[PDB]
Amino acid sequence: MVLLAAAVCTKAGKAIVSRQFVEMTRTRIEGLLAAFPKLMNTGKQHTFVETESVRYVYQPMEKLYMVLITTKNSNILEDLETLRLFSRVIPEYCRALEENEISEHCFDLIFAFDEIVALGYRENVNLAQIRTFTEPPINMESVHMKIEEKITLTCGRDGGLQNMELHGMIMLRISDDKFGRIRLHVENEDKKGVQLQTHPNVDKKLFTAESLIGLKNPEKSFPVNSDVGVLKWRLQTTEESFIPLTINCWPSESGNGCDVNIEYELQEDNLELNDVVITIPLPSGVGAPVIGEIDGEYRHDSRRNTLEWCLPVIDAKNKSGSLEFSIPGQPNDFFPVQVSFISKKNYCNIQVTKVTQVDGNSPVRFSTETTFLVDKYEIL
Numbered sequence: 001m002v003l004l005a006a007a008v009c010t011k012a013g014k015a016i017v018s019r020q021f022v023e024m025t026r027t028r029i030e031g032l033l034a035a036f037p038k039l040m041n042t043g044k045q046h047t048f049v050e051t052e053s054v055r056y057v058y059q060p061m062e063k064l065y066m067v068l069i070t071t072k073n074s075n076i077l078e079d080l081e082t083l084r085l086f087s088r089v090i091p092e093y094c095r096a097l098e099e100n101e102i103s104e105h106c107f108d109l110i111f112a113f114d115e116i117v118a119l120g121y122r123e124n125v126n127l128a129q130i131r132t133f134t135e136p137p138i139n140m141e142s143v144h145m146k147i148e149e150k151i152t153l154t155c156g157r158d159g160g161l162q163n164m165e166l167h168g169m170i171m172l173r174i175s176d177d178k179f180g181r182i183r184l185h186v187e188n189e190d191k192k193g194v195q196l197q198t199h200p201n202v203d204k205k206l207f208t209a210e211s212l213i214g215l216k217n218p219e220k221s222f223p224v225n226s227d228v229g230v231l232k233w234r235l236q237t238t239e240e241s242f243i244p245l246t247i248n249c250w251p252s253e254s255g256n257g258c259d260v261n262i263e264y265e266l267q268e269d270n271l272e273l274n275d276v277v278i279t280i281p282l283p284s285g286v287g288a289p290v291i292g293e294i295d296g297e298y299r300h301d302s303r304r305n306t307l308e309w310c311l312p313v314i315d316a317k318n319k320s321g322s323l324e325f326s327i328p329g330q331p332n333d334f335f336p337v338q339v340s341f342i343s344k345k346n347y348c349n350i351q352v353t354k355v356t357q358v359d360g361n362s363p364v365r366f367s368t369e370t371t372f373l374v375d376k377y378e379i380l
Contacts, residue, residue, distance in 0.1 A: 001120030002072045003079075004054070005029050006086065006113045009037040009065040010099040016064070017106045019113030021120055037065035047080065057083055064097035066090060082122035086112070092127045108134060138177040141363040143355065145224075146171045149346045151237045152375035154336075157249055164237030165193040166348035167375065172231075173221035180359035183214040184226050187351045195234030199225035235348045242347040244273060244372065245339055247379045249280075253331075258283075258323045262309075262337070266316030267345075275342040278309040278319070281335045287324030294318070336380040343372035 005025050007018040015033035020026060032054065036042055041056040043049035048057055057068040057079050068083045093108040094101045102109065111133055116125045149168030156162060188211060204227040205212040213227040224231030237243065248263035262280055266273060276296075282289070282305050289300040289307060296311030298319055309319050357363050 002074055003068070003070050003082075003117050003120035003122065005032075005069055006082070006117050007033050007067045007069060008090065008097065008102055008109060009033040009067045010097075010102070011038040011063055011065055012099060013038060016099050016102045017109045019110050019117075021114065021117065032069065033065075033067060037067055041065060041067065055079075059083065059087060061097035064099065064102065066097060078122055082117055082124075085125050086116060089116070089125055089127060089130060092130065136177045137175075138360055138363075141176045141360065142366045143172065143174040143176065143357070143363055144366055145352055145355070145368040146173070146371065147346050147350055147352070147369075148371045148373070149348050149350070150373045150375040151241055151243065151347050151377070153237060153243050153377045153379070155243075155246070155379040157380050159246065159248070161238060163192075164241060164243065165234060165375075166237040166241045166346075167195075167234045168346060168348050168350065169233070170224050170226075170231040170350065170352070171221055172217060172224045174217050174219060174363075176217070176219065176357065176360075176363060178359050179216050180357045180363075181214060181216055182355055182357045183212055184224070184228075184231075184355050185210070185212060185353040186226075186228055187349065187353065189229040189233075189235055189348070189350075190239040191229075191234070191236040192238040193234055193236035196230035197225050197232040198227055198230045199223055199232070202227050204228075229350075237347065240349055242267060242349060243377075244341060244343045244345075244347055244374075245276070245377070247278065247337060247339065249334075249337060249379070251334060254322065256327060257287075257325055259321075260323060261318075261320045263318050264314075264316065266314060267343075269315050271343065271345060272313045272315050273341045273343045274313045275340060276311045276314055277340045279306050279338045280309070280321075281306045281337065282323060283325060283332050285326040285328055287326060289321050289323050291319065291321035293320070334380060336378045339374060339377050339379075341372075341374045341377070344370055346370045346372050 008016055010016045013034045015030040018029040036051050036056055041049045041058045042051040055070045058065050089112045093105045116123055147170040149166055151166045153164040154162040202215045205214055211228050244267055246265045250261045252259040291298045295317045298309040300307045352368055
């Protein structure tokens with residue numbers, strides 16, 4: 001509200017008809033209208049006159065006052081304009097102003113008042129419209145980058161990629177004096193899946209060729225979450241991720257028994273994985289297994305109904321086993337084998353090409369390390 005009430009008055013000493021938009025001025029309406037409009041609103045034949053700290057705008061018609069009252073105001077033109085439009089609407093209802101005829105068309109006038117001024121804000125009306133209603137240490141300066149990633153895979157016996165996805169972040173720990181600007185350059189990523197998050201203080205640079213990211217690092221360790229892919233993302237292992245292991249499973253029906261050969265393949269021979277385990281499941285009518293493996297230890301476990309092969313570290317390697325089964329029922333479909341592994345590379349293929357720091361002399365990138373871990377890695 002800005003407009004307390006819109007009121008038609010008789011200077012008989014009473015508000016003849018009046019409108020209270022929201023319950024506030026009930027009885028209050030009559031006393032104001034009754035005292036002030038009698039004196040011509042205390043006017044001198046001026047449309048604006050203010051008395052008892054209430055702005056009264058008016059027009060005399062006979063012994064009657066058509067009155068607008070406000071005690072606040074948004075604009076000069078507006079207060080007059082609602083009164084004016086009211087003055088087009090009032091003779092349509094009452095043939096000028098006159099207390100008895102005003103009284104009889106309380107409903108008409110009152111309805112117009114609600115329509116004209118709604119919650120004290122001056123809407124507009126017109127006679128046709130009315131009708132529808134009534135119808136420093138920099139010697140120390142060093143930087144370290146750690147890329148930690150987990151890869152997930154589902155693959156068929158055929159070696160179908162199925163779905164895969166890599167999750168990771170690159171954490172940076174930096175001891176640098178001053179506030180140095182750093183630019184990070186990384187390889188370009190694609191992702192069938194989606195997710196990338198950027199740390200604040202990461203800026204994106206647009207270059208004609210190559211992509212670049214720059215930022216002032218927080219000191220100590222923080223998730224870079226740089227721009228580009230980001231240094232906090234879920235990339236799809238599917239999108240160009242390498243799966244460190246591929247398992248080729250050859251089950252064989254020895255007849256009564258079953259012979260299973262499991263083939264494991266690693267990436268470049270030079271790289272070695274650690275904490276590798278292959279879980280090869282077995283059928284319920286187990287008998288006992290005989291397993292042979294060149295490297296690591298392998299053990300059959302009943303209960304689990306799985307044969308688990310563990311290898312501390314592997315350039316790459318394979319295992320074989322023969323199973324004995326009582327044969328109840330018919331043949332059983334195989335359940336997928338899962339693997340756990342650790343690799344000193346990221347198989348999201350994130351590479352830190354270059355991180356150049358400014359604001360000072362060359363810092364030493366003492367070390368960049370990559371920890372790759374298996375997520376749900378399943379192959380049938």
